[PDB]
Structure formats: structure tokens, C-alpha cells
Amino acid sequence: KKVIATKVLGTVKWFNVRNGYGFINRNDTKEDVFVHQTAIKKNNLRSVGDGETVEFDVVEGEKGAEAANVTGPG
RNA sequence: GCCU
């Protein structure tokens, strides 16, 4: 999977722990990117909370762009 | 595992 962008900031629109995925709104493009639980760095469960600010890379998965290496902004 |  190709890295599209790096160190992108965004706000978690929602993340459902039951389905194991959610969406993050990129602050730079205002577009939603898919985020799966496996793509989140640990100590985060592998989860993020609604409305929180996260930093992440954007990569090209099988069904389009998605987040990777998702953490807090520090 | 693409709108809860």
C-alpha cells in the first residue's frame, strides 16, 4: 500500500468499537478518510474517541484512501 | 474493514 500523505492532522468524526472502524475528517482537505482499528497505534484498546484530534498517514488500501499509524498529535 |  502506497503512502499518499504523512503527518496529516484530522478530527475523528466517529469510531465504532463494535464494527471496528470509523472515519477521520482531514483538517487539510476536509475529506473523510476510512480508519480501521488495526491502523491505530496501541494504548489508544486500538481505538480513538469521537471529536478528538489525531495525527496519521494516508495510504491507498483496497477500497480507496484510509488512515494508517493513527496517534495523538502530541 | 466504507457512514455507525
Swiss-Prot record:
It is found in: Cytoplasm; Nucleus; Cytoplasmic granule; Secreted. Residues 14-19 are annotated as: C5-methylcytosine binding. Residues 10-70 form the CSD domain. It comes from the Eukaryota. The modification Phosphoserine is found at residue 47. The record marks 14 as: Important for C5-methylcytosine-recognition. Ubiquitinated by RBBP6; leading to a decrease of YBX1 transactivational ability. Phosphorylated; increased by TGFB1 treatment. Phosphorylation by PKB/AKT1 reduces interaction with cytoplasmic mRNA. In the absence of phosphorylation the protein is retained in the cytoplasm. Belongs to the YBX1 family. In the CSD domain, Trp-14 specifically recognizes C5-methylcytosine (m5C) modification through its indole ring. Homodimer in the presence of ATP. Component of the coding region determinant (CRD)-mediated complex, composed of DHX9, HNRNPU, IGF2BP1, SYNCRIP and YBX1. Identified in a IGF2BP1-dependent mRNP granule complex containing untranslated mRNAs. Component of the U11/U12 snRNPs that are part of the U12-type spliceosome. Identified in a histone pre-mRNA complex, at least composed of ERI1, LSM11, SLBP, SNRPB, SYNCRIP and YBX1. Interacts with IGF2BP1 and RBBP6. Component of cytoplasmic messenger ribonucleoprotein particles (mRNPs). DNA- and RNA-binding protein involved in various processes, such as translational repression, RNA stabilization, mRNA splicing, DNA repair and transcription regulation. Predominantly acts as a RNA-binding protein: binds preferentially to the 5'-[CU]CUGCG-3' RNA motif and specifically recognizes mRNA transcripts modified by C5-methylcytosine (m5C). Promotes mRNA stabilization: acts by binding to m5C-containing mRNAs and recruiting the mRNA stability maintainer ELAVL1, thereby preventing mRNA decay. Component of the CRD-mediated complex that promotes MYC mRNA stability. This is Y-box-binding protein 1. It comes from Homo sapiens (Human). The chain holds residues 52 to 129 of 324 of the full protein.
